[PDB]
Design a binder for this molecule. Structure first.
Ligand SMILES: NS(=O)(=O)c1ccc(F)cc1
Length: 126
C-alpha cells in the first residue's frame, strides 16, 4: 500500500539521519576523507527519498486523498528547503569553507527537526 511505501520512505529518511550524524562527527574531527564519502552517500539517500516521496504524493493524488495531498505538498516543499541547504553544504565542503559548512549543517538540522511533526502526520493520513 501507499502506507507501506511511506514506511519504506521513512526508513530511507532515517538512514540519512544516521549517516548525517556520523558525518557531523567526522567533520568535527577533521576527517575530510570520511566526510567526502558520507556526503556522497547522503546525496544518493536524499535522491532516493525524494523519488519515494514523489511517488507517494502522486499516488495520494490519484487516490483523491485530499488531506494526505495537502500534507505531502507541504512536506515536499520543506524537503526541498533541506535539499538546497544540503547542496550549499556540499559546495562549502568543496570550497574548503568550514564556517559555511558549520552554518549549513546546523540549519539543515533545524529544518529537519521542524519537519518531523508533519512527517508523523502524513503516516496517519495516507
Ligand atoms: N532537510 S531534509 O528534508 O532532510 C533534506 C536534506 C537534504 C536533501 F538533499 C533533501 C532533503
Amino acid at each position: 500500500s501507499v502506507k507501506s511505501e511511506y514506511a519504506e520512505a521513512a526508513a530511507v529518511g532515517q538512514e540519512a539521519v544516521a549517516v548525517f550524524n556520523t558525518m557531523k562527527a567526522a567533520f568535527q574531527n577533521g576527517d575530510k576523507e570520511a566526510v567526502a564519502q558520507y556526503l556522497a552517500r547522503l546525496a544518493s539517500l536524499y535522491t532516493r527519498h525524494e523519488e519515494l516521496l514523489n511517488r507517494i504524493l502522486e499516488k495520494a493524488r490519484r487516490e483523491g486523498n485530499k488531506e494526505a495531498v495537502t500534507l505531502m505538498n507541504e512536506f515536499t516543499a520543506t524537503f526541498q528547503t533541506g535539499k538546497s541547504i544540503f547542496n550549499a553544504m556540499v559546495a562549502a565542503f568543496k570550497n574548503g569553507d568550514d564556517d559555511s559548512f558549520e552554518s549549513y549543517l546546523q540549519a539543515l538540522e533545524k529544518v529537519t527537526a521542524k519537519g518531523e511533526t508533519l512527517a508523523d502526520q502524513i503516516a496517519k493520513a495516507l
